[PDB]
């Protein structure tokens, strides 16, 4: 495996082995008045500013230089061009990786198999807008003649999380749009509780599935059709309440949907990178096409930043290499994402898929097994919520946890003359300051002394009140969370993920880890039927199945 | 630190040292037909069964004996008795830890400071039931004489997550109950979007806060009151629309709340263990008191199981020691919680707080700094969703991640004649089976050949199709997710957390980690006012504040 044999990597490791544990944030800031200026970057997108302050990280100019050298020697730049140029970098599936084409507002030609993909991309987009216009304006009618009031997206994984996270994040921009719902779990509870709140006469379903044969998605789609038909009765009315995001014309038409209402995307569009394509139809329907195009433009802006900016000042590259530093040198298993924004409550979950499904790999592009760590476990909750739940462990646990704190300067709801947002901002700032600064034993002793504690009571509590600090964080502040800014932020992390994948020499765009569980599930399905004991598996699987057969009848 | 000096621990570590990496699940099952029988526990609660199958773990009977010996030498049994008997085991705050008293259905006396706490516990429960009856029945009217249709819980941390997670989990048992809402984030977006869907004359607010001085909660409460009075206008009507879960009579009365509508709890009720107290009022209002008592009874049943069962067959002890095995011997940073149940969509988030806030500590009860790992990072999303998001990394990443898979045999919505649940169950079973078994190079090769793959295509794909397996999991299956069973499950994990804390010799019931961040935030708040630059902090904190001031009125 390449990384471990790379000269720059070894130099980095050697340096960390010798000076790594010596790095101390408090000391670094105390001896360098220019630290913030030297370890941060402000980006003016013309539609708001984004400040990436990575100064509270365990790095020095020397460390950053070494990290940038590694990025260069790993061919991050050549790899980037290959992606943007339509080359088939998805080596195991022999496919191009072009979510950047989906939002290529510049319409600069991107050729794949001797053909520019932009024309087809724009064809679908125009098709999406036209349809969106009919639904939003009321022109489109239910089988009863009523306008659509609710839109239900049915899909799993990448066909669900992106649309859900974005519509949740851009709720303030949904004025005039129908309400949107998202069904994803095969668990019957999901579709059942969702359908109970809807009127079939004014409900529009969006079945999101490339092949249109995805078990969970199609099962849910069929259940929704039965629910609908229970009221509508006529199978021909389905074409008025169901549309598809797919390419399988036959299966779509067989379902009862009109091929005219099938919005397609391509194989170079990964599920976890597809909200920018037809998959984003529910987004466009909710916030309008102008806002949707703003979302795409934001991503496009960041794509250009990534492609034209020197590595030293390249946002995604910097985030990626800082992550490599903590993952491969410090050995940190996780990456926390803490947005101080309730609208971004599903932002961390979105990147759990985007990051983990992309880089949770162990085989390199050459077929060799890695002998080093790859993708981290991404997790988190919007602040200050999460702040009152698990920060205890971040501040005083036994784990080093890189944290990305994000927040918009301007709130969408400046209630109480901005009092709420002021407090939110203060906590956003105070937490990273606290994680960095900590509170020494002497500092805590003085507080306890001043609190009239007896020598005995003081000694008993003292160590518990000490904060060792030196806990690194990135602070990402943006003017306002608009469709454009959100687009830029999502694209920024998409590229961070891309860069790390290159450094580790893995394929960030396939997902073979899915078939094993899938094949074993299909084998078990028919065995669940009936009350006869199963003995064809390992004793555990056998035991579980038999307990299930025994208890499915139990009358509590 | 006590743990490192414990002889049973050193014996365990030496064994691991010498045998650890040699353990292979597939090989263990292949060579022992009694594995499931030997490593599974079935609990009959008389109100449904709970099967704890821990056979797919990297353990042998020898390993389990060493783990149980460690639990015993660390005094888990005596510590448990001290908790149940009301001793002040919360050593740093010198307080008892009695969430078990809250659900002590048996009413066996529990003495604290020379006084049985049960009378006051039951008094509050009776008060809660009485109030709920009036609200639910429509007896309690708003200032305009209308019945209450919406209940809004305002609180943060332990005063929020439990009530939210339980009401979400028990939705099927809420018929005839008012809609419940939860406001927690200080972020104005939270209270604003909630208030926008409410009618002040039929809305009842529950302000959950012990001291009633919690900044976020009180700020949200004041905003809700201003909103209410904009319509009500008459201050005296507040007593008909606001109640409190607190003990600060002065502040409550000052807020405008009738002190007779203040439901109390005690200092031995930790926030993250408070849903069983008055904090659970929103739960009672949503599902009725009979169901709330079932929830309490379920926890009481698990409490009894924990107190009377020999360690070797004690569910919480087994879960705890398996965790210790992975944390302190294998070095796993995280613990995944994967419930295959949409209703339990906030279950993992709940324990992310319950576990991490309790055991994210680094100072032992003797004041020594731990020289070993403590609490893990808890995370997860309900199965299939999570299954289509990040399982790629669990299956083929470079991290060992213990996973708890949970699922009810009987679904609350057996739609399509049980088809959805059948698929859900098959996946629940197949996933742990796949994680254990994996797929060898030769197995994958055979599949690729049968698939008709060409020689070189097979060669390039082969390694990527291999699953190393040997990934440990616990499967927890229960007859049905009822209020009683849910209570039992929550209590089971609370005790798992307790046992681990005892083994590590830390105080699982304090949370000093909160102080530093709060103190720094209060100092920054006033500095945000005005446009003059701030220079009183480290350059990063300074720079972030100044960017905020600059961008505050940037027009986008």
Is residue A351 within 8 A of residue A379, CB to CB? The reply is no
- C-alpha B242/C-alpha B153 separation (Å) is 10
Please give the Cα distance from B544 to A35 (Å, whole number): 13
Largest CA distance in chain B: 83
Q: Which residues contact A419 (CB under 8 A, 6 or more apart)?
A: B219
Q: Could you tell me how far CA A410 lies from the centroid of its own chain?
A: 23
Place of tokens 């004996």: B65
**By three-state DSSP, how is residue B115 classified?**
strand
Answer for the pair B508, B498: CB distance below 8 angstroms, yes or no. Answer: yes
Q: Distance between CA A212 and CA A249 in Å, rounded?
A: 9
Q: Is A58 exposed, middle or buried (0-12, 13-18, 19+ CB in 10 A)?
A: buried
DSSP string, B410-440: E-S---GGGHHHHHHHHHHHHHHHHHHH-B-
Residue B286 marked as a ligand binder: no
Beta carbon pairs, A and B, within 8 Å: 512
Residue B552: exposed, middle, or buried by beta-carbon count in 10 A (0-12, 13-18, 19+)? Answer: middle
Among chain B residues, CA nearest to A481: B556
Rounded CA-CA distance A288/A277 in Å is 15
Element (H, E) at A153: strand A150-154
Show the tokens assigned to A3. 């990384």
* Least CB–CB distance from B513: residue in A374, A375, A391: A391
The conformation of residue B94, written as its DSSP 8-state character, comes to: T
CB B24 within 8 A of CB B435: no
Q: What is the largest CA-CA distance in chain A?
A: 83
Bridge partner residues of A379 (DSSP):
A336
Contacts of A270 in chain B (CB under 8 A): none
Chain A residues with CB-CB distance to B433 below 8 A: 520, 524, 537-538, 540-541
Sheet strand arrangement including B49-53? B40-44, B49-53, B473-480, B403-410, B334-339, B377-379
Angle at B183 between CA B182 and CA B186, to 5 degrees: 160
Closest CA to A490 of A275, A264, A172: A275
Q: Characterize the bridge pairing of strands A49-53 and A473-480.
A: antiparallel
Q: At what angle do helices B483-504 and B289-308 cross, to 10 degrees?
A: 40
Distance CA A138, CA A151 (A): 13
Query: Strand pairing partners for B378?
Result: B335
- Residue B36 corresponds to which tokens in the numbers above? 């499931």
Catalytic (active-site) positions of A: 357, 388, 518
Contacting residues for A238 by C-beta, under 8 A, at least 6 apart: A225, A228, A229, A232, A255, A256, A257
Helix (H, G, I), strand (E, B) or coil at B379: strand
Nearest CB among B189, B388, B540 relative to A56 is that of: B540
Query: How many angstroms separate the Cα of B250 from the Cα of each of A329, B224, B244, B259?
Result: 54, 20, 12, 9
Nearest-CA distance from A406 to chain B in Å? 12
Tokens of A262: 């099938």
Look at residues A354, A346, A416 and name the one whose alpha carbon lies nearest to residue A170: A346
The response to whether A88 counts as a known ligand-binding position is no
* Count of Cβ atoms closer than 10 Å to residue A96 Cβ: 23
Q: How many other CB atoms are there within 10 angstroms of residue B84's CB atom?
A: 18
Question: Which member of B373, B421, B547 has the closest CB to residue A398?
Answer: B373
A508 annotated binding-site participant: no
Structure-token pair, residue B384: 């299939």
Cα three-residue angle A489-A360-B454, rounded to 5 degrees: 120
Strand (E) or helix (H) holding A339:
strand A334-339
CB contacts of B26 in chain A (<8 Å) are 538
* Nearest residue to B417 (alpha-carbon basis) of A207, A226, A235, A233: A226
Q: Residue B373: left (phi > 0), alpha (psi -120 to 50), or beta? A: beta
* Set B33, B233, B518, B555: catalytic member: B518
Residue B322, H or E segment = helix B315-324
* Residue of A391, A430, A460 lying closest to B520 (CB–CB): A430
**Cβ neighbours for A173, distance < 8 A, ≥ 6 positions apart:** A287, A288, A291, A482, A483
Label residues B244-265 b or e (16+ Cβ within 10 Å = b): bbbbbeebbeebbbeeebbbbb
Are the C-beta atoms of residues A454 and A263 closer than 8 Å to each other? no
Q: Do A415 and B53 touch (CB under 8 A)?
A: no
Closest B-chain CA to A425? B525
Question: Does the annotation list B388 as a binding residue?
Answer: yes
- Which neighbouring-strand residues pair with B402? none
Residue A311: strand, helix, or coil: helix
Q: Is A204:A239 a contact under the CB 8 Å cutoff?
A: no
B188 and A427 within 8 Å at the Cβ level: the answer is: no
CB contact under 8 A, B551 and A49: yes
The residue among B366, B429, B525, B527 with the most chain A CBs within 10 A of its CB, best to mutate, is B429
B34 is catalytic: no
* Rounded Cα–Cα distance for residues A124 and A130 (Å): 10
Pairing of strands A377-379, B242-245: unpaired
Distance CA A513, CA A519 (A): 11
Of chain B, the end-to-end C-alpha distance in Å amounts to 56
Distance (Å, whole) CA B137 – CA A246: 50
Sole residue written with tokens 């790629």: B392
Q: What residue in A sits closest to B169 (Cα-Cα)?
A: A189
Distances (CA, A) of A534 to A543, B29, B42, B51, B474: 8, 16, 18, 17, 20
Contacts of A379 in chain B (CB under 8 A): 377, 379
Contacts of B410 in chain A (CB under 8 A): 551-552, 554
**Cα-based torsion angle of the residue sequence A408, A410, A414, A419 in order, rounded to the nearest 10 degrees:** 70
Q: Assign B148 to helix, strand or coil.
A: coil
Query: Residue B554's Cα: distance from chain center in Å?
Result: 41
CB proximity list for B149: less than 8 A, separation 6 or greater? B178, B179, B199, B202, B203
Distance CA B424, CA B338 (A): 13
Q: Which DSSP helix (H) or strand (E) runs through B53?
A: strand B49-53
Q: How far is A235 from chain B (nearest CA, A)?
A: 18
Nearest residue, CB atoms, B556 vs list A48, A189, A512? A48
The secondary structure of A517-539, three-state, reads HHHHHHHHHHHHCCCCCCCCCCH
Query: Can you read off the two tokens belonging to residue A492?
Result: 């920024």
Which chain A residues are closer than 8 Å to B382 by Cβ?
185, 187
List, as one string, the DSSP characters of B443-508.
Answer: HHHHHHHHTT--HHHHHHHGGGG-B-----EEEEEEEE--HHHHHHHHHHHHHHHHHHHHHHTB-T
- For residue A340, the chain B residues in CB contact (below 8 A) are 187
Is B518 assigned a catalytic role?
Answer: yes
| Contact (CB<8Å) B29/A539 | yes
Q: Which two tokens stand for residue A291?
A: 């806002």
CB within 8 Å of A421: residues ≥ 6 apart: A411, A414, B187, B188
State how far residue A221 is from chain B, nearest Cα, in angstroms: 12
Contacts of B425 in chain A (CB under 8 A): 528, 548
Query: Which residue in B360, B410, B545 is closest to A429 by CB distance?
Result: B545
Phi, psi of B93 (to 5 degrees): -105, -5
Give Cα B15 to chain centroid, integer Å: 33
Both tokens of A216, joined, read: 């969970």
Instruction: Output the CA–CA distances (angstroms, integers) from residue A17 to A11, A23, B91, in the order listed.
Output: 10, 12, 39
Rg (CA), chain A: 26
Which helix (H) or strand (E) covers residue B377, if one does? strand B377-379
As given in the structure block, the two tokens for residue A148 are: 């659509």
- Asked whether A359 and A508 are in contact (CB, 8 A), the reply is yes
Searching chain B, which residue's CA lies closest to the CA of residue A516?
B434
- The rounded distance, in Å, linking the Cα atoms of B418 and B420 is 6
Q: How far apart are CA A421 and CA A471, in angstroms?
A: 25
Q: Report phi then psi at B469, rounded to 5.
A: 60, -150
Most A CBs within 10 Å: which of B159, B273, B364, B388, as the mutation test of the A interface?
B388
Strand-strand pairing, A377-379 and A334-339: parallel
State the pairing for strand pair A150-154/B49-53.
unpaired
Could you give all domains of chain B from N- to C-terminal order, each with its CATH number? Answer: 1-98+294-514 (3.40.50.10490), 99-293 (3.40.50.10490), 515-555 (1.10.1390.10)
A394 to B439: CB separation less than 8 angstroms, yes or no: no
What is the least distance, in Å, from the CA of B545 to any CA of chain A?
8
d(CA B381, CA B337): 7
* Rounded CA separation B251/B247 (Å): 9
Q: Do A333 and B513 touch (CB under 8 A)?
A: no
Asked if residues A164 and A177 have their Cβ atoms less than 8 Å apart, the reply is: no
User: Encoding tokens for residue B329?
Assistant: 């011997």
Q: Looking up tokens 């760590």, which residue turns up?
A: A373
Which entry of B216, B264, B293, B357 is annotated as an active-site residue?
B357
Query: What distance in Å separates the CA atoms of residue B536 and residue A39, rounded to the nearest whole number?
Result: 19
Structure tokens at A167: 């519509």
DSSP, res B376: P
Which tokens in the block code for residue A54?
A: 């990575």
- A161 and A346 Cβ atoms separated by less than 8 Å: yes
- DSSP-assigned letter for residue A271: G
Decide if A556 and B479 are in contact by the 8 Å CB cutoff: yes
CA distances to A403, B42, B165 from A344, in Å: 16, 41, 19
Which residues of chain B are within 8 Å of residue A92 when distances are taken between CB atoms?
460-461, 464
**Counting every residue, how long is chain B?**
556
Q: Would you call A541 and B389 a contact, using CB atoms and an 8 Å cutoff? A: no
Q: Which residues contact B254 (CB under 8 A, 6 or more apart)?
A: none
For residues B413, B418, B419, B422, the Cα torsion angle rounded to the nearest 10 degrees is 100
| Look-up of token digits 């009377």 | B308
Token representation of residue B167: 């009401």
Question: Is A518 flagged in the annotation as binding?
Answer: yes
Secondary structure of B173-216 in HEC code, one letter for each residue? HCCCCCEEEEECCCCHHHHHHHHCCCCHHHEEEEEECCCCCCHH
Q: How far is CA A146 from CA A135, A141, A231, A538, in A?
A: 11, 5, 15, 55
Identify whether the C-beta of residue B78 lies closer than 8 Å to the C-beta of residue B88: no
Give CA–CA dist B182/A345, Å, rounded: 14
Rg (CA), chain B: 26
Instruction: Find the residue in B nearest to A420 (Cα).
Output: B188
In A, minimum Cα distance to B543 occurs at A36
Experimental determination approach used: X-ray
d(C-alpha A111, C-alpha A153), whole Å: 31
Test B374 with A367 for CB contact under 8 angstroms.
no
SS3 annotation, A445-502:
HHHHHHCCCCHHHHHHHHHHHCECCCCCEEEEEEEECCHHHHHHHHHHHHHHHHHHHH
In a 13 Å sphere around the CA of B353, the CA atoms on its Cβ side amount to: 25
Breaks in chain A (C to N over 2.5 Å), named by the residue before each, are none
For an interface test with B, which of A32, A215, A392, A523 has the most B Cβ atoms less than 10 Å from its Cβ? A392
Neighbours of A532 (CB within 10 A): 9
Kindly list the strands in the beta sheet with A203-208, ordered across the sheet, starting from the edge strand earlier in the chain: A179-183, A150-154, A203-208, A242-245, A262-263
Tell me the C-alpha distance between A121 and A109, whole Å: 11
- What DSSP string describes A403-445? EEEEEEEE-S---GGGHHHHHHHHHHHHHHHHHHH-B-HHHHH
Closest residue by Cα to residue B169 from B421, B339, B342: B342
CA distance B157 to B160: 5
* Tokens of residue B255, six digits: 């807020």
Closest CA to B170 of B337, B347, B390, B404: B347
Contacts of B508 (CB under 8 A, 6+ apart): B358, B359, B361, B497, B498, B500, B501
- Of the candidates B65, B388, B399, B446, the residue annotated as catalytic is B388
Q: Who's near A244: CB < 8 A, 6+ residues apart?
A: A206, A207, A208, A209, A212, A252, A255, A257, A261, A262, A263
- Structure tokens of B180? 């419940």
What is the CA A141 to chain-centroid distance, rounded?
Answer: 35
Query: In Å, what is the CA distance from B193 to each residue of A374, A532, B183, B224?
Result: 40, 52, 10, 12
Cβ A74 vs Cβ A505: under 8 Å: yes
| Residue A204: both structure tokens together | 């529009």
């Amino acid at each position: 495996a390449a990384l471990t044999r790379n000269p720059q990597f070894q130099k980095l490791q050697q340096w960390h082995r010798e000076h790594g544990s010596e790095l101390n944030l408090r000391h670094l800031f105390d001896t360098d008045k220019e630290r913030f200026n030297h370890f941060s970057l402000t980006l003016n997108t013309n539609h708001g500013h984004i400040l990436l302050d990575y100064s509270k990280n365990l790095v020095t100019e020397e460390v950053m230089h070494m990290l940038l050298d590694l990025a260069k020697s790993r061919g991050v730049e050549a790899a980037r061009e290959s992606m943007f140029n339509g080359e088939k970098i998805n080596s195991t599936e022999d496919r191009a990786v072009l979510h950047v084409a989906l939002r290529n507002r510049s319409n600069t030609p991107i050729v794949v198999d001797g053909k520019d993909v932009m024309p087809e991309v724009n064809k679908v987009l125009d098709k999406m807008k036209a349809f969106c216009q009919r639904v939003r304006s009321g022109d489109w009618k239910g089988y009863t003649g009523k306008t659509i009031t609710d839109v239900i997206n049915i899909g799993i994984g990448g066909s669900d999380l992106g649309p859900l996270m974005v519509t949740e994040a851009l709720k303030p921009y949904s004025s005039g749009g129908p309400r949107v719902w998202f069904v994803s779990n095969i668990d019957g509870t999901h579709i059942a509780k969702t359908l109970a709140c809807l009127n079939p006469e004014s409900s529009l379903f969006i079945i999101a599935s490339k092949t249109f044969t995805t078990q969970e998605t199609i099962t849910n789609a069929k259940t929704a059709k039965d629910w609908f038909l229970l009221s509508a009765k006529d199978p021909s009315t389905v074409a008025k309440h169901f549309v598809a995001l797919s390419t399988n014309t036959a299966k779509v038409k067989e379902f009862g949907i009109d091929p005219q209402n099938m919005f397609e995307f391509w194989d170079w569009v990964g599920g976890r990178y597809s909200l920018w394509s037809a998959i984003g139809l529910s987004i466009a329907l909710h916030v309008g096409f102008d806002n949707f195009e703003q979302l795409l433009s934001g991503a496009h802006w960041m794509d250009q930043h990534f492609r034209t900016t020197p590595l030293e000042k390249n946002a995604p590259v910097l985030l990626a290499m800082l992550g490599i530093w903590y993952i491969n040198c410090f050995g940190c298993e996780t990456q926390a994402v803490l947005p101080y924004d309730q609208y971004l409550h599903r932002f961390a979950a979105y990147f759990q898929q985007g990051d983990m499904e992309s880089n949770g790999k162990y085989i390199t592009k050459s077929g060799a097994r890695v002998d080093h760590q790859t993708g981290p476990i991404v997790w988190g909750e919007p602040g200050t919520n999460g702040q009152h739940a698990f920060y205890q462990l971040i501040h005083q646990g036994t784990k080093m946890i890189p944290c990305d704190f994000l927040i918009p300067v301007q709130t969408q709801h400046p209630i109480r003359k901005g009092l709420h947002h002021k407090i939110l901002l203060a906590n956003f700032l105070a937490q990273t300051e606290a994680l960095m600064k900590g509170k020494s034993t002497e500092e805590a002793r003085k507080e306890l002394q001043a609190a009239g504690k007896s020598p005995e009571d003081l000694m008993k509590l003292l160590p518990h009140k000490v904060f060792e600090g030196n806990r690194p964080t990135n602070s990402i502040v943006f003017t306002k969370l608009t469709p454009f800014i959100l687009g830029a932020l999502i694209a920024m992390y998409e590229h961070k993920i891309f860069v790390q994948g290159v450094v580790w020499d893995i394929n960030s765009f396939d997902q073979w880890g899915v078939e094993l569980g899938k094949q074993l599930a299909k084998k078990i399905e028919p065995e669940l039927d009936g009350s006869s004991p199963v003995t064809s598996h390992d004793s555990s699987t056998n035991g579980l199945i038999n307990f299930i057969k025994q208890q499915r009848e139990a009358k509590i």
